C-alpha cells in the first residue's frame, strides 16, 4: 500500500514505479539463481551479476550511477531515493506542509 | 592535467558552461557517457554547470569537494572506462575469439567422448546396474511408461528378452565375484551397447554424487577428529591411511604406535573404528570398493568437465550470435541486456540440444531456440499484470488483423468487424482488447499548477468516513441502552446470539448450553425480545439509525 | 457488523445487494436540466428513455 | 510516546526480521480476477 | 506496514555507500573509488589476504 | 559545545581549550545542524542519511 497498483476507470490500472523496479530486481535475481544452477558460461554469469547490481542501484537511487532507467514511457523511473529527496519528495511536500 | 584548471576556473567564476566543459575535456574522450558522468562529477561536487546576481548558494563542501577533485584527477587518465553494462558486455564478448567455422563438429566430438566416459563410469557400478534391471522389471511390470528407462539404442518383446539377457550377464557377474574383474569387464562391455533415459541417468549421477559426498563426509569424521582436532600428522597419515584403507593396521595397529600423535588418537579410537566399519559397510552398499567407485566418478567428472569446457567456447561464439539475434525487440518493454540474457540461456539450451547428425549449421537452429526463449521471456516478464503467453499471442493476432482491417476497411476495426474477420465470439475479444492496455504510472506529471501527479487524485474507497464511525459508536451506545431496558435473559441471549459487545456469535445450541435449555426455548426468548423491541419506546431511538 | 446486525434483525429491513452511485447535482448549483443525452455501447439494450 | 530517532545500518538478520516473508516471483496480480 | 525481503543470490553494494562522494566503502578500506568500481563490475580482481 | 566543556573545566583545575570563533554564511551555518531529520529536510538528503 505504499507502492500500490490501483484500479482506474476503464480497467487500466495505475502503478507506482517501485513495482517496476522491484520486478526488474526480482527477475534478474531469479535469472542469476537459474544461471548459477546451470553451471553457465561464467561471462554470462558476470553479465547477470552486473545487471542485477545495476537494477538494485536503480531501485535504491536511479540516475546515480549511470543514466536513469528508463522509463517504460520515456521518463526516468523514480526510486526510493527519489521518493525521499527532491523538492517534490517526501521530506518536504507532505512532511512539512500538508493538506 | 588540464581539467584541474577547469575546476579552478569554475570555482573562480562560480559556474561552468557547456562551452568551457566541451573545451577543457580530454581530447580523445570519445565517450559521451563518461562525458556525462564527468560533468556530473564536476557538478556533483559543485560548482554547478550551465550553458550560459547568480547568488543562490554553495551547498557543498570541504569533504566531497576534494572527493570529486580526486575522481577528476584520476578520470583524466581513465582511458578504457565506459563503465556501463551494455558496453562492458559488448567489449568482453567481442574480445573473445569467434573461433567457430565448423569447429562445432570437433567440439561435438569432444562432448561425445566426454559423455561416453560418464556412461562407462556409471555402467561399471554394480548397484546401478541392479537399479537398471530393477527398472526394466518394473517398467515391464508396469511401474512407469514402458520406455521410461532407455532412449532407444544403436521393440517391446525382443527388447525385454535383450534386458533379460543383460540381467543374466550381470547377475552371473555378481555370482562370480581376479575372477570378479573379468566378469565386471564382461558387465561393462555388455552394457556398453545400450542407452538409458537421461532422467534415470540423472538420478544415477546424483546417487554417485551422494556416494562421493557421504564417503568424503566419513573421510572428514576420520580425519577432523584427529587430523583436525588432535592434529594428526599429514604425510604419515597419508602413507598409512591411503595405502591400507581396509585393515585394522591403519588404525588398530597405529594406536599401538605411542608416537606423539598415536598418543592422541585413543580418544577417537572407537569412533574411527565406527568409521572403518562404515567404510567396509558402504563398500557393500555400493557392492564394490570405495577406491573403485571413487576413481570411477573421478574419471566421470573428468569427462564431464571436459565436455563443459567446450560448451563454454561455443557459447562464446554463439553469444555473439545471440547479441546478433536479439536486436529485433529493443522496444518491447524489456531491457536489452535482459533480452541478451534470455538469449544466452536459450543458447546454452540449444547448445545442449544442437545436433551435428543432421549436418545442419549451428546458427539456424540455435537461433530457432533463441528466438523461442527470447519471445518466451518477453511474453513472461514484460508486463506487470502477467497475462499468459497464449493471451499475448491472441492480442498479437488481433493487432495483426487490426492493421490489416484498418488499411483495407478505411475507417477502423471494431468488435463486430473483428469478430467477423477473426474466429472469436464477439465478447472475449471485448475482454482481450480491454486487457491489453498498460497501467499508467502513478507519477505521471498532471497538467496542473502545483506540479501535481496522477497519484494525488486517486481517492480512497475503503475508508469509512468519521461520520460513519460516529454513526456506529452512536449505534453501539443506543443498542446498549435499549438492551439495558430488558431482563438479563433477553440482554444476555441477544448479546450472545448476535455479536454484541462480545466475541464470536454462537449458534442456538451454544446459547442453550450456556442457559442449560434447549434451542427452541432460546428461539422463543429471542423472538420475545425482538417483539418487545419492535414497538416504539424501544424502537424510536434505534429506528432513527435507519435512513430507509 | 454487530448491533447494526441486531437493528436489521429487529426492524427486518433487508440489506440491499446493490450500492447507490447515482449522478446527483453538485452542491450549490441550482439550474434547470435543459438537455439529456444518452449514449450506449453497441449491442446493448437501450432503456425506455434512450 | 517515543524519545529520539535512532539510526544505523541494517543487519541482514535485522532486514530478515523486518520482513513478513520472502518475495520470490515478479507477479503483481491476476489479470482476470485481480487478486 | 508489513515489509518483504528479496534474497539476493549474489551480494550487491549499496549505491549510497559507493557513490556518496566520499565513498564510505572506498574511504573505509582506503581503496580509491575507481579501483572499487573496477573490482565491482568484474573488470579486475582484488586479493583478500 | 566548546563553551560548555571548557567552562566546566574552568570550574575544575584544568586549562580549557583556547577557541577561535569562525564566521559562516547562512547557507553553511544551516548546513551544520545537530538533528539529521531537519538536515535531511532542507539539504541533500542522500548525503545526510
Ligand atoms: C499525460 C496526460 C496530460 C494531459 C495534458 C494525462 C493527464 C491524465 C491522463 C489520462 C487519465 O489518467 C485518464 C485515462 C486513464 C486511462 O486508463 C488511460 C488514458 C487516460 C485518458 C489517461 C492518458 C494521459 O496520461 C492523461 C490524458
Ligand atoms: C483535474 C484533472 C485536470 C487538471 C489538468 C483531471 C484530468 C483526468 C482526471 C483523472 C481521470 O479522469 C481518471 C480518474 C477518473 C475518476 O473518476 C476520478 C479520478 C481520476 C484519477 C481523475 C483525477 C483528475 O480529475 C484528473 C487527473
UniProtKB/Swiss-Prot annotation, chain C:
Coiled coil: none
Signal sequence interval, chain numbering: none
Quaternary structure and partners: The RNAP catalytic core consists of 2 alpha, 1 beta, 1 beta' and 1 omega subunit. When a sigma factor is associated with the core the holoenzyme is formed, which can initiate transcription.
Family (UniProt): Belongs to the RNA polymerase beta chain family.
Role summary: DNA-dependent RNA polymerase catalyzes the transcription of DNA into RNA using the four ribonucleoside triphosphates as substrates.
This protein's name: DNA-directed RNA polymerase subunit beta
Organism, scientific name: Escherichia coli O157:H7
Gene for this chain: rpoB
Whole-protein coverage range: 896 to 945 of 1342
Curated annotation (Swiss-Prot), chain E:
Domain of life of the native organism: Bacteria
Biotechnology: Co-administration of salinamide and rifampicin or salinamide and myxopyronin suppresses the emergence of resistance to both antibiotics.
Post-translational modification remark: Acetylated on several lysine residues in the presence of glucose.
Protein name: DNA-directed RNA polymerase subunit beta'
Function, in words: DNA-dependent RNA polymerase (RNAP) catalyzes the transcription of DNA into RNA using the four ribonucleoside triphosphates as substrates.
Portion of the parent chain present: 100 to 148 of 1407
UniProt family annotation: Belongs to the RNA polymerase beta' chain family.
Description of how the protein assembles with itself and partners: The RNAP catalytic core consists of 2 alpha, 1 beta, 1 beta' and 1 omega subunit. When a sigma factor is associated with the core the holoenzyme is formed, which can initiate transcription. The rRNA transcription and antitermination complex (rrnTAC) consists of RNAP, NusA, NusB, NusE (rpsJ), NusG, SubB, ribosomal protein S4, DNA and precursor rRNA; S4 is more flexible than other subunits.
Amino acid at each position: 500500500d505504499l507502492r500500490p497498483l490501483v484500479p482506474l476507470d476503464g480497467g487500466r490500472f495505475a502503478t507506482s514505479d517501485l513495482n517496476d523496479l522491484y520486478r526488474r530486481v526480482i527477475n534478474r535475481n531469479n535469472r542469476l539463481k537459474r544461471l548459477l544452477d546451470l553451471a553457465a558460461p561464467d561471462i554470462i554469469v558476470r553479465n547477470e551479476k552486473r545487471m542485477l547490481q545495476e537494477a538494485v542501484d536503480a531501485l535504491l537511487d536511479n540516475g546515480r550511477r549511470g543514466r536513469a532507467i528508463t522509463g517504460s514511457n520515456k521518463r526516468p523511473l523514480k526510486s526510493l531515493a527519489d521518493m525521499i529527496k527532491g523538492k517534490q519528495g517526501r521530506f518536504r511536500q507532505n512532511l512539512l506542509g500538508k493538506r | 592535467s588540464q581539467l584541474k584548471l577547469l575546476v579552478t576556473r569554475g570555482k573562480e567564476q562560480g559556474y561552468l558552461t557547456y562551452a568551457e566543459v566541451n573545451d577543457h575535456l580530454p581530447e580523445d574522450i570519445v565517450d559521451s557517457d563518461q562525458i556525462e558522468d564527468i560533468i556530473q562529477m564536476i557538478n556533483d561536487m559543485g560548482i554547478q554547470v550551465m550553458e550560459e546576481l547568480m547568488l543562490a548558494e554553495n551547498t557543498a563542501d570541504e569533504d566531497a569537494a576534494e572527493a570529486a577533485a580526486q575522481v577528476l584527477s584520476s578520470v583524466e587518465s581513465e582511458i578504457g572506462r565506459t563503465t556501463d553494462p551494455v558496453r562492458m558486455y559488448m567489449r568482453e564478448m567481442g574480445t573473445v575469439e569467434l573461433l567457430t567455422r565448423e569447429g562445432e563438429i570437433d567440439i561435438a566430438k569432444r562432448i561425445e567422448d566426454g559423455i561416453n566416459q560418464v556412461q562407462c563410469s556409471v555402467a561399471e557400478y554394480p548397484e546401478a546396474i541392479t537399479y537398471l534391471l530393477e527398472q526394466y522389471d518394473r517398467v515391464e511390470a508396469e511401474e512407469a511408461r514402458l520406455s521410461d528407462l532407455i532412449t532407444g539404442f544403436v521393440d517391446p518383446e525382443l527388447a525385454r528378452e535383450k534386458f533379460a539377457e543383460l540381467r543374466a550377464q550381470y547377475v552371473v557377474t555378481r555370482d562370480t565375484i581376479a575372477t570378479a574383474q573379468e566378469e565386471i569387464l564382461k558387465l561393462s562391455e555388455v552394457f556398453k551397447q545400450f542407452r538409458l533415459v537421461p532422467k534415470q541417468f540423472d538420478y544415477l549421477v546424483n546417487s554417485m554424487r551422494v556416494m562421493m559426498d557421504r564417503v568424503r563426509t566419513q573421510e572428514r569424521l576420520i580425519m577432523k577428529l584427529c587430523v583436525e582436532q588432535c592434529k594428526m600428522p599429514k604425510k604419515n597419515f597419508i602413507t598409512l591411511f591411503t595405502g591400507n584403507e581396509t585393515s585394522d593396521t591403519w588404525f588398530n595397529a597405529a594406536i599401538a604406535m605411542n608416537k606423539p600423535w598415536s598418543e592422541k588418537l585413543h580418544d577417537v579410537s572407537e569412533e574411527v573404528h565406527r568409521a572403518l566399519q562404515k567404510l567396509q559397510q558402504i563398500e557393500e552398499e555400493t557392492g564394490l570398493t570405495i577406491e573403485q567407485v571413487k576413481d570411477i566418478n573421478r574419471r566421470m567428472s573428468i569427462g564431464e568437465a571436459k565436455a563443459r569446457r567446450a560448451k563454454k567456447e561455443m557459447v562464446e561464439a554463439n553469444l555473439r550470435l545471440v547479441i546478433s539475434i536479439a536486436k529485433k525487440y529493443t522496444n518491447r518493454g524489456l531491457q536489452f541486456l535482459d533480452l541478451i540474457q534470455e538469449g544466452n540461456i536459450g543458447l546454452m539450451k540449444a547448445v545442449d540440444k544442437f545436433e551435428y547428425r543432421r549436418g545442419y549449421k549451428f546458427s539456424t537452429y540455435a537461433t530457432w531456440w533463441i528466438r523461442q526463449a527470447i519471445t518466451r521471456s518477453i511474453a513472461d516478464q514484460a508486463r506487470t499484470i502477467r497475462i499468459p503467453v497464449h493471451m499475448i499471442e491472441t492480442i498479437n493476432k488481433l493487432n495483426r488483423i487490426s492493421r490489416q482491417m484498418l488499411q483495407e476497411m478505411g475507417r477502423e476495426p471494431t468488435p463486430e468487424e473483428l469478430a467477423e474477420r477473426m474466429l472469436m465470439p464477439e465478447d472475449k475479444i471485448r475482454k482481450v482488447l480491454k486487457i491489453a492496455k498498460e497501467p499508467i504510472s502513478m507519477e505521471t506529471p498532471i497538467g496542473d499548477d502545483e506540479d501535481s501527479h496522477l497519484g494525488d487524485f486517486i481517492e480512497d474507497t475503503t475508508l469509512e468516513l468519521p461520520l460513519d464511525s460516529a454513526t456506529t459508536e452512536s449505534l453501539r451506545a443506543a443498542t446498549h441502552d435499549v438492551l439495558a431496558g430488558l431482563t438479563a435473559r433477553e440482554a444476555k441471549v441477544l448479546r450472545m446470539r448476535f455479536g454484541i459487545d462480545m466475541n464470536t456469535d454462537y449458534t442456538l445450541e451454544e446459547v442453550g448450553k450456556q442457559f442449560d435449555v434447549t434451542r427452541e426455548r432460546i428461539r422463543q426468548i429471542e423472538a420475545k425480545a425482538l417483539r418487545k423491541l419492535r414497538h416504539p419506546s424501544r424502537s424510536e431511538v434505534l429506528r432513527s439509525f435507519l435512513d430507509d | 457488523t454487530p448491533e447494526e446486525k441486531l437493528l436489521r434483525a429487529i426492524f427486518g429491513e433487508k440489506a440491499s445487494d446493490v450500492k447507490d452511485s447515482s449522478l446527483r447535482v453538485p452542491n450549490g448549483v441550482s439550474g434547470t436540466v435543459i438537455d439529456v443525452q444518452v449514449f450506449t455501447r453497441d449491442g446493448v439494450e437501450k432503456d425506455k428513455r434512450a | 510516546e517515543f524519545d529520539a530517532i535512532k539510526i544505523a545500518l541494517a543487519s541482514p538478520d535485522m532486514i530478515r526480521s523486518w520482513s513478513f516473508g520472502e518475495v520470490k516471483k515478479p507477479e503483481t496480480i491476476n489479470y482476470r480476477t485481480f487478486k | 506496514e508489513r515489509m518483504g525481503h528479496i534474497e539476493l543470490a549474489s551480494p550487491t553494494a549499496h549505491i549510497w555507500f559507493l557513490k556518496s562522494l566520499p565513498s564510505r566503502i572506498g574511504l573505509l578500506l582506503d581503496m580509491p573509488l575507481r579501483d572499487i568500481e573496477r573490482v565491482l563490475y568484474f573488470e579486475s580482481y582484488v586479493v583478500i589476504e | 559545545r566548546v563553551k560548555i566543556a571548557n567552562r566546566e573545566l574552568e570550574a575544575n583545575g584544568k586549562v580549557g581549550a583556547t577557541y577561535s570563533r569562525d564566521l559562516l554564511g547562512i547557507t553553511k551555518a544551516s548546513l551544520a545542524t545537530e538533528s539529521f531529520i531537519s538536515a535531511a529536510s532542507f539539504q541533500e538528503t542522500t548525503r545526510v542519511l
